[PDB]
Structures are given as C-alpha cells and as structure tokens.
C-alpha cells in the first residue's frame, strides 16, 4: 500500500504545516501537525476541557463505530517550546492520503496548554519519530508509520514541505518526479528516539564550505533551524544590523535586509536554503525588526533541522531495519 497527502502552511510565515487525517467510522477529518520530532498521535476531542478549545475541530469517539477505549491508558507530553497536552487513549481507524491503519492509538486530549488553544488551525499532532518516545502508559503505543510499515510497498515516508506553498507527505514510495538530481542518504542514530544524523558542514552565502560535523535531528514539528552558536554567529555576521536580542529571544535583523543563503552538508552533497526562507517577518505587527530563521541551539541540548532546513529539500525517512535519512534538492 501507499498514501499521499497534501500538507499546507498554517499561516503566511510557514510556522507549521497541517495535513488532513481521517479518524473513525464514519470518518472525522482533523488537520494534524505531522511531527518527525515526537511519537504521539493526539487530537482535540469531545473530552478536551471546554475552555481550552477555541475553534479546533474535535474528535468525538462516541460517534465512531470503530473507536474503543484503551482501558487504563493515559498520556502526557511536553514539547521543546514548553507546550504540553495530556489525556486518555482510544484505538480507532486512521487514514492518511488513502493509507489506512486499523487499531491506531488515538490519544484524546483532556488538557492542552495555552499555545495549542490559541492556534485554531492545528487539531492535533501526528508523531513520526521512533515509537520508543511514545508517552502512553502503562503500555507504550506505536506511531502511525510503525503500524503501517509492514503493509507499505517500501518502509519509508517522505516530507516535501513547501516555501509559502503546499507540499506533500508520501508513505510507502519515493516520487522520483518530486526532486532534482540524486538522493544522498546518511546514517541515523535512534538512540534518543529521533531521526538523528550528522551534517558534514555549512556555508554562508557564497562563502567557502566549512567541513565540520553537526549532529542534529530532522524535525518537521520545529519551525526554525537551530544550530551551534559558532555557526549561527557566522551566519548573522553577514547581515548588516543583525543582533542577538535577549528581550526578543534570538537573532533579529533589519526588515530592509536581503538575507544570504545557508548551505548544509549531507555527506558530499549540499542543500541550499535560500535567504528568503530565513525571514520570519516583523517581531510584532508593524515593527522594522524581523525575526531570524536560524537560531542558536545552545539552550536546547540538541541541534534541530526544522522546517527552515527541511523545506529546502526532498527528505526521505527510511524506516528499514537500519533506518537512514535521504536528502535531495528540488
């Protein structure tokens, strides 16, 4: 089997991407944030505290003839941005782009933090990291990809995120029309539960490539590119007036600037992020200070190849017995 679904930016900045997912019988369609940095499929639901729902579409398990309470199971998750959610668990039928998994754990939110409530466009998350990170207790549950893998034509999914435009998540096949050149594959460590890999270096603009190992994660659920302070300083030093602002929480730059590109290495190959992809617009409405898309990871503990980086590539998440990642230009 295969599946193919369009993913759409939630706003004009590409802060996140939503993908329609069918849950239950008859289908209830929710728009979920596909997140290769976590491993829980959770949804706003009829159980979510009413004051914490503000415009999201909810899953109502009592209206699904295939829903079953997973008795005793609870979940609770905290994300790198400080947001969180928690609740109980049903199993139900879940379909993405024509690919159907029966018995998928659908984690129903009883509580969500304010940033989820405040984002009316995201009805939940669909985790695509390794199932060892799934938070369900006392019986850990598998991701949608893990459950579908055996049925897929090939044990892979691909992320093709657009810049200010829709893109595609495919399951079970590699669309050879969706990228240019060849796909360069690189080793993955699953030891922390992430799609963790080592970039071979970077360049700023038309500058020379610096060969240096950068360990980080491919994370579709993180908006920006988080890299070591040395790398980030070298980038923003090429932008007149750019500075790190403690009050704003990162590097800002004059909105009048033209940003240089940023290149990252994948083995001997190179992925070029255009300068425009690094512009996240005014820090507040009407400001001439703009927020940068490349930020320091120094306070995180891990480097994060988020959407800013991934949207410049066609990315293969290869879930073979030894997982690997592939990157192609597009």
From Swiss-Prot:
Catalytic activity reads: Hydrolysis of proteins with specificity similar to that of pepsin A, prefers hydrophobic residues at P1 and P1', but does not cleave 14-Ala-|-Leu-15 in the B chain of insulin or Z-Glu-Tyr. Clots milk
Q: The organism sits in which domain of life?
A: Eukaryota
**In the UniProt record, does the keyword Glycoprotein occur?**
no
Query: What GO molecular function terms would the record report?
Result: aspartic-type endopeptidase activity
Q: List the disulfide bonds.
A: 255-290
Q: Which UniProt keywords apply?
A: Aspartyl protease, Disulfide bond, Hydrolase, Protease, Signal, Zymogen
Name its GO BP terms in alphabetical order: proteolysis
Q: Tell me the protein's name.
A: Endothiapepsin
- Species source reads Cryphonectria parasitica
Lineage, uppermost ranks: Eukaryota, Fungi, Dikarya, Ascomycota, Pezizomycotina
